[PDB]
Design a protein around this ligand. Structure first.
Ligand SMILES: [Mg+2]
Ligand SMILES: [Mg+2]
Ligand SMILES: [Mg+2]
Ligand SMILES: [Mg+2]
Ligand SMILES: [Mg+2]
Lengths: 93, 274, 348, 113, 104, 64
RNA sequence: AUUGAAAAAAAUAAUAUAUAUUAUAUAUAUUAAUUAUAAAUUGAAAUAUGUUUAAUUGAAUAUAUUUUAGUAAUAGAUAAAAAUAUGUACAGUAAAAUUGUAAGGAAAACAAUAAUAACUUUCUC
RNA sequence: GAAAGAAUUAAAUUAAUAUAAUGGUAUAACUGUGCGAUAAUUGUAACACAAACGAGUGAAACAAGUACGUAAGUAUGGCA
């Protein structure tokens, strides 16, 4: 909510395919126009964000697929494998 | 002005007066910066911190055990010597300087459960000497710092006039940044995990480096700065990149404790230690 | 769930407005803030996301802690420890915080802020110490009211003063303020709010207004005059407004005479001091004291000797300032005082 | 009249600057302000308890260290001196890595050297 | 001789109105050489990235492991072409043929 | 030598004036001071017309 | 007031209205803004009737109006780089030397360098 | 036992002071900052210091109006 506007004008140069596709992905805000009533307040936009609300930006090359935090040892309740708890500390008894 | 004579009148009570509360001015500076009503408000704890959690879970106990010394005692530092009163001229004579130093040195306490070493801050120094001819390189260096770290950089201005180096005074030669908490944790994590492994011939940090009372400093070149994710992502916007010094300030009473702590955080060391 | 219980807990530890209570304890973000009166503004407003369930969990945590504090308080015996534990138990209550923060603390309403309750008393103490006490001490020190009248002051009660009978307007006098003769012509009323553990059924208070600036030509100096004096006054945490309703002629050791400065006699300071009488044990009922009225000077007063002789300890103070104007003659005539003197313009 | 380098650096310092990028001030109702106050008090108390639990654990560990040292000193001075020998040059193993938030493909390595 | 861009009259940021600086950052996922992933805050609009050379495949940080393959950037420069150009020779025969020189 | 003299004249049509020195190229001086004839603080401006140095107006509403 | 929705509230302050006092006070009402200021055929948005389209909807084209982009440093009552040398109010402490640190060396820039007995608030055994 | 405050003590006037040298300055007179740009205003000036004269120096107080300050108050150019 208290976050700055994204300066896309620096991360995407003029007239480039990346800039075009980023713009296509993004959804613009509502501009103020005389003769209309805006119950939530007259829009106040600078650099493409409505200042009264948060701003949402959507974005060998295979996607990142994280590994499961629970292991075969976890499910099989193996008391000897060194994987029974990847987040806890184990101690030898 | 009738006179220049500072003099504070004594009071007749023990009540502490802060005039910032009696002045109706500056209403919004009366709130603490942690108060949601303050315009200076900035959320602090937004996510967990892997490095801090690791240090609290594992390294504190190990460091305590390692640094334990049986029946240890405080080693007092070099302090100002006192004149023996064998001559009257010693009555109001200022004390003497420490034996070997012109500055006093701190005492070293035994490591105990309350004073285990830990990281307290990181400061990055970027002084572009070639900015003497071009002031815009300072802005570029500040952007490099902002992208690498994520904190607000602060400018560095020339202070001395050295002709041989053609360095004037009062000009912007670079930028600095100080990191604490999660942000320094992230910076160190990314350094160790990405940048240092990508250096050509990297053996670690010199074991004879750091101020003698806790704190380790080491540098990075421009090619080394090119390894950070932000620069690699948009190489196009980085025709030129600048190196910088990195100063890690810890709670270590002495330097070797800080070296052990950083080794715990996976910082290699190669040289022979003092 | 001790905070939901009110069998023994005072009813003031709850928000008396059902709408605000329901909004603060709401289950889903379906209601709207009662603070925002206009619907338009209510639609414009948007509460921070993910705020009610975190609030529920924080409430549960704080309430468990408060329950532990109440458990230990029910077993403690020393009254000071009992009061401290009660304060620690109810300090974090959202309802208490709401009530105190957003309701009057001076003309408090018993059902919102009850000063019989330790938590409200402690929060009031903190509020007073934040701003009011510092200003009082600054005014006393700067106007030199402390050394001139009494050696020092350790504030322990909030004293407010007003002049309701004189003009008809309502205003609590700021310390060190200049008041007109018309304003200060009739009589002041006091309000002494106490924030410490004091036995309401035994303790008695005295109030002295003195002027340590009345000129004295015998030695070319000043002297102190007892403007006003009351003794044997009993207060209560919630009923502590002194006025001719709450005292008798036996409490008056010196009827009120107004500020009547003389022309070119300087700015005079009228300082109010509140003392608490000794609290003898092994005896039932308030310990009243008789003032030696044939020894009281009333024009050559010695306040230090007075308090030393009657074993009084100051707990609060106030001050205002006065200077000559046109209405002084009228006040003198009205009170049957002789015509005022006129002093030179130059101090030689 | 400016150079393309000037424009580039002005864009960089635009990314620096806060002009035309910050949202409106966050104004909260009285009730939500009280809610937030309770959240922060709860979190502060919680973190204090966590810190104190860790501190107590370290106190107990240190007490154990000193008790063990006394016992070993009185039982066998040779082993006591071996234990009390300094570890000034000690470093941690280089694979005692800081935990990450998702595990690797090979969870554990069962061979070495 | 120095080049500088002119200073404009700084806007006055009053006492109490000075807000903090919260730059826009993304919760980006960062994959190391192994299958491990770290979440971090980045200002680049790239929510996902993988590294080819990093801590998890460096001898200095990985002393215990017996085998550790190294790799560099692909589709850049003339790398690996010194092998792709010679197919007749292929991998132990050369090791045996490099027994000794017999020179003195 | 490097400094010149100037006659500041009061705005109220009272004839009162006060004199001050100023650098050869300093900006035109105007100052509020007491005017005994009208018994109050009033403005004082230059009497004659002086060759003032030219300083650029500040870039305030951003240009180009 | 309308506008997603069934008695009214009880603080400091600010704003609007009004009237008490030879008292910068009180009553009701509400809780705005807080990084902005002209000039842009050319970059990017939001607004209608055909449209292809499935009650819609929709996504794409055309125009009228409007909005954004002039992209500029301090975000801290800033504190020994350079700039305002006279007033007032609030607040702080320099300097050398030593130890380190990419280029960096005697000399550029950053970091570290005296002691906590007593007193508070909080957490905890 | 631990955090966060309030700070206290030792040292420092060697840095800095618009400018020589001397005296003074951390309670700062040095430095940062918000208002401001106002007192770098007006009519009487006692009394002192210094002093052949002529001149010079500090300045209480009365009156008029300004700026800053919650207030106490400060400001009739610059630490001298
Ligand atoms: Mg000077
Ligand atoms: Mg000197
Ligand atoms: Mg003489
Ligand atoms: Mg003479
Ligand atoms: Mg001055």
């Amino acid at each position: 909510r208290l976050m700055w506007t994204f300066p896309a004008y620096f991360y995407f140069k003029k007239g480039t395919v990346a800039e075009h596709k980023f713009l296509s992905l993004q959804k613009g805000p509502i501009s103020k126009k005389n003769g209309i009533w805006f119950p939530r307040g007259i829009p106040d936009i600078k650099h493409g964000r409505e200042r009264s609300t948060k701003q949402e930006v959507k974005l060998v090359n295979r996607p990142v697929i994280p590994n499961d935090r629970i292991t075969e040892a976890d499910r099989s309740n193996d008391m000897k494998s060194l994987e029974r708890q990847l987040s806890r500390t184990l101690y030898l008894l | 002005p009738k006179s220049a004579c500072s003099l504070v009148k004594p009071v007749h009570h023990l009540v502490k007066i802060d005039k910032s509360k009696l002045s109706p001015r500056f209403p919004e500076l009366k709130y603490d910066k942690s108060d949601i009503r303050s315009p200076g408000f900035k959320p602090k704890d937004t996510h967990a911190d892997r490095l801090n959690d690791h240090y609290l879970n594992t390294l504190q106990s190990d460091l305590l055990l390692i640094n334990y010394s049986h029946n240890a005692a405080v080693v007092k530092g070099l302090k100002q010597r006192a004149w023996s009163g064998d001559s009257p001229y010693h009555l109001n004579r200022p004390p003497k300087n420490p034996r070997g130093s012109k500055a006093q040195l701190p005492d070293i306490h035994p490591i105990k459960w309350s004073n285990i070493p830990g990281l307290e801050s990181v400061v990055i120094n970027c002084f572009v000497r070639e900015a003497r001819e071009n002031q815009l390189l300072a802005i570029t260096a500040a952007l490099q710092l902002q992208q690498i770290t994520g904190c607000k950089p602060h400018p560095i201005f020339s202070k001395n006039d050295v002709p041989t180096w053609k360095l004037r005074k009062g000009h912007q030669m670079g930028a600095k940044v100080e990191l604490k908490g999660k942000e320094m944790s992230q910076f160190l994590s990314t350094l160790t995990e990405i940048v240092l492994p990508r250096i050509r011939e990297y053996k670690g940090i010199s074991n004879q480096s750091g101020n003698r009372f806790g704190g380790i400093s080491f540098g990075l070149t421009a090619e080394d700065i090119k390894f950070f994710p932000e620069i690699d992502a948009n190489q196009d916007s980085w025709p030129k990149t600048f190196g910088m010094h990195i100063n890690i300030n810890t709670s270590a009473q002495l330097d070797y404790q800080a070296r052990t702590l950083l080794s715990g955080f996976q910082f290699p060391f190669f040289g022979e230690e003092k | 769930h001790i905070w939901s219980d009110f069998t023994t807990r005072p009813s003031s530890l709850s928000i008396q407005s059902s709408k605000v209570k329901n909004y603060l304890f709401q289950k889903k973000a379906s209601l709207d803030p009662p603070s925002i009166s206009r619907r338009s503004n209510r639609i414009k407003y948007s509460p921070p996301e993910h705020i009610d369930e975190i609030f529920r969990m924080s409430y549960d945590f704080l309430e468990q802690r408060s329950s532990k504090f109440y458990e230990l308080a029910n077993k403690t015996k020393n009254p000071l420890k009992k009061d401290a534990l009660l304060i620690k138990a109810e300090i974090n209550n959202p309802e208490v915080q709401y009530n105190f923060q957003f309701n009057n603390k001076l003309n408090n309403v018993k059902d919102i802020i009850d000063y019989d309750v330790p938590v409200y008393r402690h929060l009031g103490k903190q509020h007073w110490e934040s701003y009011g006490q510092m200003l009082l001490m600054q005014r006393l020190e700067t106007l030199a009211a402390i050394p001139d009248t009494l050696p020092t002051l350790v504030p322990r009660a909030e004293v407010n003063i007003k002049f309701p009978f004189s003009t008809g307007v309502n205003k609590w006098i700021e310390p060190g303020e200049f008041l007109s003769s018309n304003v200060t012509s009739m009589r002041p009323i006091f309000k002494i709010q106490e924030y410490e553990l004091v036995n309401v059924e035994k303790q008695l208070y005295t109030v002295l207004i003195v002027n340590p600036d009345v000129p004295d030509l015998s030695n070319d100096s000043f002297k102190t005059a007892l403007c006003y004096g009351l003794v044997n006054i009993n207060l209560t945490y919630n009923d502590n407004l002194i006025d001719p309703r709450k005292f008798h002629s036996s409490n008056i050791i010196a009827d009120y005479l107004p500020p009547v400065p003389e022309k070119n006699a300087g700015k005079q300071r009228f300082v109010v001091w509140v003392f608490r009488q000794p609290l003898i044990e092994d005896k039932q009922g308030p310990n009243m004291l008789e003032i030696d009225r044939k020894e009281l000077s009333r024009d050559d007063f010695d306040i230090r000797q007075f308090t030393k002789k009657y074993n009084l300890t100051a707990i609060g103070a106030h001050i205002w300032r006065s200077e000559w104007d046109a209405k002084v003659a009228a006040v003198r005539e009205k009170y049957g005082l002789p015509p005022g003197r006129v002093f030179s313009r130059v101090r030689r | 009249s400016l150079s393309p380098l000037a424009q580039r650096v002005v864009t960089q310092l635009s990314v620096m600057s806060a002009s035309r990028k910050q949202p409106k001030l966050l104004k909260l109702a009285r009730e939500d302000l009280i809610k937030h106050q309770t959240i922060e008090k709860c979190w502060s108390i919680y973190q204090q308890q966590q810190r104190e639990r860790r501190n107590l654990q370290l106190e107990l560990q240190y007490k154990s260290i000193e008790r063990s040292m006394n016992l070993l000193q009185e039982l066998s001075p040779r082993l006591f001196e071996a234990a009390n020998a300094s570890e000034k040059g000690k470093r941690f193993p280089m694979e005692m890595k800081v935990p990450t938030d998702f595990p690797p493909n090979t969870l554990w390595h069962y061979n070495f050297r | 001789t120095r080049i500088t861009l002119p200073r404009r009259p700084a806007k006055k940021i009053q006492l109490g109105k000075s807000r903090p600086a919260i730059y826009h950052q993304f919760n980006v996922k960062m994959e190391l050489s192994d299958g491990s992933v770290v979440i971090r805050r980045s200002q680049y609009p790239k929510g996902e990235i993988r590294l080819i050379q990093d801590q998890r495949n460096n001898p200095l940080w990985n002393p215990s492991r017996d085998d550790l393959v190294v790799v560099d950037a692909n589709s850049g420069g003339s790398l690996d072409r010194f092998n792709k150009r010679y197919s007749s020779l292929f991998s132990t025969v050369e090791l045996s043929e490099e027994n000794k020189k017999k020179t003195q | 030598s490097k400094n010149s003299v100037i006659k500041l004249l009061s705005t109220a049509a009272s004839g009162y004036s006060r004199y001050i020195s100023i650098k050869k190229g300093a900006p035109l001086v105007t100052q509020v001071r007491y005017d005994p004839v009208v018994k109050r603080h009033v403005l004082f401006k230059e009497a004659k017309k002086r060759k003032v140095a030219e300083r650029k107006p500040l870039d305030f509403l951003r240009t180009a």
